[PDB]
Amino acid sequence: TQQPIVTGTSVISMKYDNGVIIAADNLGSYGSLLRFNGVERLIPVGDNTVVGISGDISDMQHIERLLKDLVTENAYDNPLADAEEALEPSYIFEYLATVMYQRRSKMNPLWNAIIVAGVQSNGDQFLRYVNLLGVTYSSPTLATGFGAHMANPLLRKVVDRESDIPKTTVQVAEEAIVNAMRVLYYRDARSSRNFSLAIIDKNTGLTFKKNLQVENMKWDFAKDIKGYGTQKI
Amino acid sequence: MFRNNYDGDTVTFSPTGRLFQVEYALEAIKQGSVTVGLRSNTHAVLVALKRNADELSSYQKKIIKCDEHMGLSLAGLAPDARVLSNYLRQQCNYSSLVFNRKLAVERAGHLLCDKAQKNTQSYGGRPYGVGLLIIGYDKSGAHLLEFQPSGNVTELYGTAIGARSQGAKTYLERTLDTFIKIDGNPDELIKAGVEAISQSLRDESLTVDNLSIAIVGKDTPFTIYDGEAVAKYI
DSSP, rough: OOSSEEEEEOEEEEEETTEEEEEEEOEEEEEEEESSSOOEEEETTTTTTTEEEEEEEHHHHHHHHHHHHHHHHHTTOOOOTTTSOOOSHHHHHHHHHHHHHHHHHHTOOEEEEEEEEEEEEEEEEEEEETTTTEEEEOSSEOOOHHHHHHHHHHTTTTSSGGSSTOOOOOOHHHHHHHHHHHHHHHHHHTOOOOEEEEEEEEEEEEEEEEEEOOOOOGGGGGHHHOSSSOOOO | OGGGOOOSTTTTOTTTTTOOHHHHHHHHHHHSSEEEEOOOSEEEEEEOOOOSTTSSSSSSSOEEEEETTEEEEEEEEEHHHHHHHHHHHHHHHHHHHHHHHOOOHHHHHHHHHHHHHTTTTTSSSSSOOEEEEEEEETTTTEEEEEETTTTOOEEEEEESSSTTEEEEEHHHHHHHHHHHTSOHHHOOOOOOOOHHHHHHHHSOOOTTEEEEEEEEEEEEEEEEOOGGGGGGGG
């Protein structure tokens, strides 16, 4: 892709004591037109991974298909495909990272930023980022695009350093995530009020929540804001 | 006499549906010297007898590491073994670079099978005339595979291939109940292996010069013992 057409904004995510949380709104924009509103940008791979994608939606759909194909292929002649020899988040990540860097290097990027979230077989949280340049990093929180600028600073107040992770519960992390989603709705002109959230827990497995709405907003004070300086009424 | 008309290439069935070129390839293995593989639940072990050309020469390697958790032993055409083990090294490596994933031994066997098969169905080349015993340790534990020139790969507790290998293979059947339980005790699994390969000796003895041993397992990367490294077992 030489330039993006239909696009998804921020994907955001954080680790907590027993797993990871990831969220992304359900909008596919078309320039400044808020064109499509039921676009799922979180992609579960098996029971242990959720791949969240921002950027060009055509490229996102292409990646979705690559992932389903992995699942299919991995199962061939694999008696333990649902067990010991299932796909690990780390395998899904390494594959995508390989693909993104290859496409960057052929001057034909997949025009996306991607976060891969899950839990490894030994119970370890997995959270790692890759984008259209093939750039990769991990951190206790990750966010793409606009969310990197406003969600990260919010989320880091919860998990600021590695040691904060075991002190953090799903309940607390999920609240942090949702609040960040509300803040993005306030200040990102390409955000939607509707979003999906997924939790991947070493004990409870994958929990995929569709159709969340940003709630509990403050608009009250707006009645008192008049003019832009001197105007009194 | 009749076989003579149908055995010219690997692309010809005999009237009873044999491929003699593949059957002949099997015979190439018997020209090699014996090698044994065996395993428990924690380790997998190879034992090979190496040949020299005379007293002035070195002994030929029989064991090849393919990755940290996988390697093989060979009997038959040495060049074939070089080609097929390099291929395995590449497949292991590919699995690591692209997927950050150790290639399962079962998947290694399948890839090996498909490659060898192609040589048996097209005109131009020949089947691989070498036998491979493949050991490994992956997420599903310890494994031993036997590779045949036909491409067919079989998962076994133990086996032997090469010249006079029947003795070891009989010994491994006979001792099956015992060696598969040797867990957390690598030297003991090795001793079982040396004992097995010994059944295949004809007026010849295992020395620091001719005996090669390999082991892999839980917390144990694929390691090859030769020379003075094998003395404790002799």
